[PDB]
Amino acid sequence: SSVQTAATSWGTVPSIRVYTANNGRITERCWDGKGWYTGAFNEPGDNVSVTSWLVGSAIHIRVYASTGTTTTEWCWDGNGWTRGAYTAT
Amino acid sequence: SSVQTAATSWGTVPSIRVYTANNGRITERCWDGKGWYTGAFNEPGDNVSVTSWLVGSAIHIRVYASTGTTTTEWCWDGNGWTRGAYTAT
Amino acid sequence: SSVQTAATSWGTVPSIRVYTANNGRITERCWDGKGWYTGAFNEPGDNVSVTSWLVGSAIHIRVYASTGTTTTEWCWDGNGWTRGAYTATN
């Protein structure tokens, strides 16, 4: 029926990130005040959720990507996407 | 099969907005501290996500409404819902 | 197909809560800076969304749990999960 999205934003501009699960893969579109561009995030998933927080001006993002019942956390902490410690049980 | 929701909130009261995709249409329920009422947002979609931010006391909301793989951004900036610049590619 | 999740976070640590709808039930995993543990939230639902806000250091969470077209709001205000006033229509 349809793609599934998750969105987060931060700061005053703001920056926005929209994650889209489509056909088994999640990709990312980004707005930093001037226009939309494709982000670095690209991971398997049929479902996605996201949360983010600032430490000063530094953004931290957590993306929860699920296939089946297997949910992987992906972390942005300023220097690339890394696999997080999240486990579902 | 079940309806799909997205939620955002802001301020200290807080205000809450809950968007529900049901049978191809997304509608909005709103809480501003006293009770729930039906909001102005009404757009096609099978899937919904949302983010929001304050500029001072002014709320800005972005709702991402998807059908198929077609995602439309809807913007609240204080003066009605407008179509945003978001594109998926 | 897959499980469906919703996530929220607050504060500087931060605390994170991830809600997962799986096979008709929503459960909660929690991070408070040291590790992940299973939270108190456990309610029926095929779909979940969440929002939260701080009042000072006190967290308030609202989880919207849906089955069919019936959405129930669950509230955390420091003293257990309670059913909220949310209704989907008049």
Report DSSP letters for A9-78, one per residue: EETTTTEEEEEEEETTEEEEEEESSS-EEEEEEEEE-SEEEEEEEEETTEEEEEEEEEETTEEEEEEESS
Neighbours of A87 (CB within 10 A): 11
Which of C20, C31, C32, C46 is the best substitution to test chain A (most A C-beta atoms within 10 A)? C20
CA distance B70 to A68: 23
Residue of C nearest to B16 (CA): C51
Separation CA C72–CA C67 (nearest Å): 9
Q: Taking a contact as any Cβ pair under 8 Å apart, which residues of chain A between 17 and 36 contact chain B?
A: 18, 20, 22, 29, 31, 35-36
* CA A72 – CA A44 distance, rounded (Å): 9
> Is A54 at the interface with chain B, CB within 8 A?
no
CB contact under 8 Å between B71 and A20, yes or no, is yes
Distance CA A32, CA A9 (A): 10
- Residue among B34, B13, B3 at smallest CA distance from C85: B34
In a domain, C61, yes or no: yes
CA distance A81 to A79: 7
The answer to whether residue C89 is domain-embedded is no
Question: Residue A63 falls within a domain, yes or no?
Answer: yes
Cβ–Cβ contact B62 with A under 8 A: yes
CA of A87 vs chain C CAs: smallest distance (Å): 7
> In angstroms, rounded to a whole number, what is the distance separating the alpha carbons of residues A36 and A41?
14
Distance of CA B40 to the CA centre of its chain: 10
Closest residue by Cα to residue B74 from A25, C43, A63, A18: A18
Kindly give, in sequence order, each residue whose CB lies less than 8 Å from that of residue B34, ignoring residues fewer than 6 positions away. none
Range of the domain at C15: 4-83
Domain membership of residue C26 (yes or no) is yes
CA C30 to CA C37: how far, in whole Å?
A: 5
Nearest to C36 among A60, A67, A85 (CB): A85
CA distances from A73 to A6, B59, C26, C63 (A): 14, 30, 18, 20
The half-sphere exposure of B40 on its side-chain side, counting CA atoms within 13 A, is 9
C75, C58 in Cβ contact below 8 A? no
Beta-carbon separation of A16 and B89 below 8 A: no
Q: Which resolution in angstroms does this entry have? A: 1.1
- Residues with Cβ within 8 Å of residue C43, at least 6 apart in sequence: C25, C26, C63, C65, C72, C74, C81
β-sheet bridge partners, residue A4: A21
CB contact under 8 A, C69 and B7: no
C72 touches chain B (CB under 8 A): no
Residue B41 carries which side chain, given as an amino acid letter? Answer: F
* The token pair that represents B74 in the structure block: 């809807």
Query: Is the residue at C21 inside a domain?
Result: yes
CB-CB contact of B74 with B83 (8 Å):
yes
Query: Does the CA dihedral C75-C81-C85-C88 come out positive or negative?
Result: positive
Give the bridge partners for B25, in sequence order. Answer: B22, B44
**Does residue B41 lie within any of the structural domains?**
yes
Strands C15-22 and B58-67, bridge-based pairing: unpaired
Would an 8 Å CB–CB cutoff place A68 in contact with chain C? yes
Q: Locate B35 and state its tokens.
A: 């009770």
Question: Judging by DSSP bridges, how do beta strands A25-31 and B15-22 pair with one another?
Answer: unpaired
Q: Per the structure block, which two tokens stand in for C70?
A: 């019936």
Q: Is A26 within the bounds of a domain? A: yes
- CATH number, domain at A75? 2.40.128.190
Closest Cα partner for A79 from A60, A55, A56, A53? A60
Q: Establish if A24 belongs to a structural domain.
A: yes
**Residue A49 and residue A6 in contact, taking contact as beta carbons nearer than 8 Å:** yes
Q: How many CB atoms lie within 10 A of CB A60?
A: 16
Cis-peptide, bond into residue C44, ω within 30° of zero: no
- Would you say the C-alpha torsion C31, C24, C74, B27 has a positive or negative sign? positive
Number of independent structural domains in chain A: 1
Q: How far apart are CA A88 and CA A47, in angstroms?
A: 15
